């Protein structure tokens, strides 16, 4: 799921079935292509290099689910946060609970960026144009091509953004890149339209 | 400090086996259990198993007969193999160590007693697309500079299959500025990707891109100029 809190203010994320039997809950954070890193072992012990901000609930109160809790939120703490819940009372999880995405709304719009084709792709026979969108939130764009005035019905690429930044990519062959006065890349940006072109 | 680090063949055919690597070092591996994991594609971690010198492993009940762990002493690392893959066993696998814990209460509460299980250091990773797709290795093409004082600059990294691509720029020598963008899965079912870096406009630096493909072996080094 999702969760998205204003910087300073207090994060909690829900993860795992209600409690049975008595508890050992460990988290683990994962930052935008990165591999898990460990959080909170036995339900809120911290291992080397994790502030008190974070705490877990206790493994304790029968029927409840387990919560991370993070204080204080700053732009470094948004990431996917995953459990691993140990029940006295279940088989053991060999999958982790479902994770669940923070958002910290430090606050929007895109930055695009348009390169033609290099010289190199072109001595190769290939042109690519490459439309470079970053630094949007939230995470909607659509992304639109103009060959000239006129829309491009093939050849487009593009990127569902992640954390945003999102590409798109339009195959053309050198002598389609050559003929048209330019083309153009359109990103459409709640409400807006952010407008680049190229030109031979 | 204790450092591990995965290695494997980026791309598997469906029915093959699937054979990786975690290189350790800072510790040795007898007197840690390890856990291998693997992480899908948008979706949560999966703990494969732990394994143990003493013999106190443990393997996912759901891959039961097709999964093998083992430590290697003499050149201290932990494998992994798995067989009769398919396309659900594509993911970024992980090597971690695994410290045990113990919840004890009064005798009263015996059979509530319990150890758990917490992975504390991890490795990178390793990416793994089980596919029929042969690899491509990716084609590399600058994108010159041209136009705040600051411009962009880039590579682009066309058509190449399976994931992963790494990028750096000036082998390491420049992290700032930079973006790497996530790779566009194309209709032609390759992959393509870009890296930007943003720089002052004024004939210092030289500004190259190292591109690696390791499903293929493929390593390009682009110099990218105005």
């Known amino acids: 799921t999702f969760v998205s809190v204003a910087p300073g203010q207090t994060a909690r994320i829900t993860c795992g079935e209600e409690s049975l039997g008595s508890r050992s809950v460990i988290w683990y954070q994962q930052r935008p292509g990165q591999a898990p890193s460990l959080i909170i072992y036995?339900?809120?012990?911290?291992?080397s290099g994790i502030p008190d901000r974070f705490s877990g609930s206790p493994g304790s109160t029968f029927g409840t689910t387990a919560t991370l809790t993070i204080t204080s939120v700053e732009a470094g703490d948004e990431a996917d946060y995953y459990c691993?819940?140990?029940?006295?009372?279940?088989?053991?999880?060999?999958?982790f609970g479902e994770g669940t995405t923070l958002i910290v709304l430090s606050q929007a719009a895109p930055s695009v960026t348009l390169f033609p084709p290099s010289s190199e792709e072109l001595q190769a026979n290939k042109a690519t144009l490459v439309c470079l969108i970053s630094d949007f939130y939230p995470g909607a764009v659509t992304v639109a091509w103009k060959a000239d005035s006129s829309p491009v019905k093939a050849g487009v690429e593009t990127t569902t953004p992640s954390k945003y930044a999102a590409s798109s990519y339009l195959s053309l062959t050198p002598e389609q890149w050559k003929s048209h006065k330019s083309y153009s890349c359109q990103v459409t940006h709640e409400g807006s339209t952010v407008e680049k072109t190229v030109a031979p | 400090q204790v450092h591990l680090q995965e290695s494997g063949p980026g791309l598997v055919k469906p029915s093959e086996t699937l054979s990786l690597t975690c290189n350790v070092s800072?510790?040795?591996?007898?007197?840690?259990?390890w856990s291998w994991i693997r992480q899908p594609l948008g979706k949560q971690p999966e703990w494969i198993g732990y394994?143990?010198?003493?013999?106190?492993?443990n393997y996912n009940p759901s891959l039961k007969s097709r999964v093998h762990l083992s430590l290697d002493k003499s050149k201290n690392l932990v494998s992994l193999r798995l067989t009769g893959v398919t396309a659900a066993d594509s993911a970024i696998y992980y090597c971690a160590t695994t410290k045990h814990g113990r919840r004890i209460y009064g005798v009263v509460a015996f059979k509530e007693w319990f150890t758990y299980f917490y992975m504390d250091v991890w490795g990178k990773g390793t990416s793994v697309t089980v596919s029929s797709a042969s690899t491509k290795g990716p084609s590399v093409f600058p994108l010159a500079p041209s136009s705040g004082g600051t411009a962009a600059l880039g590579c682009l990294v066309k058509d190449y299959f399976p994931e992963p691509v790494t990028v750096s720029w000036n082998s390491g020598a420049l992290t700032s500025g930079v973006h790497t963008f996530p790779a566009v899965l194309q209709s032609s079912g390759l992959y393509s990707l870009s890296s930007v870096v943003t720089v002052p406009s004024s004939g210092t630096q030289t500004y190259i891109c190292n591109v690696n493909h390791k499903p293929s072996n493929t390593k390009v080094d682009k110099r990218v100029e105005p």
């Open positions: 800072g510790t040795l591996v007898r007197d840690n259990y």
């Open positions: 394994v143990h010198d003493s013999g106190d492993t």
């Open positions: 036995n339900n809120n012990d911290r291992p």
């Open positions: 691993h819940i140990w029940d006295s009372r279940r088989p053991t999880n060999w999958v």
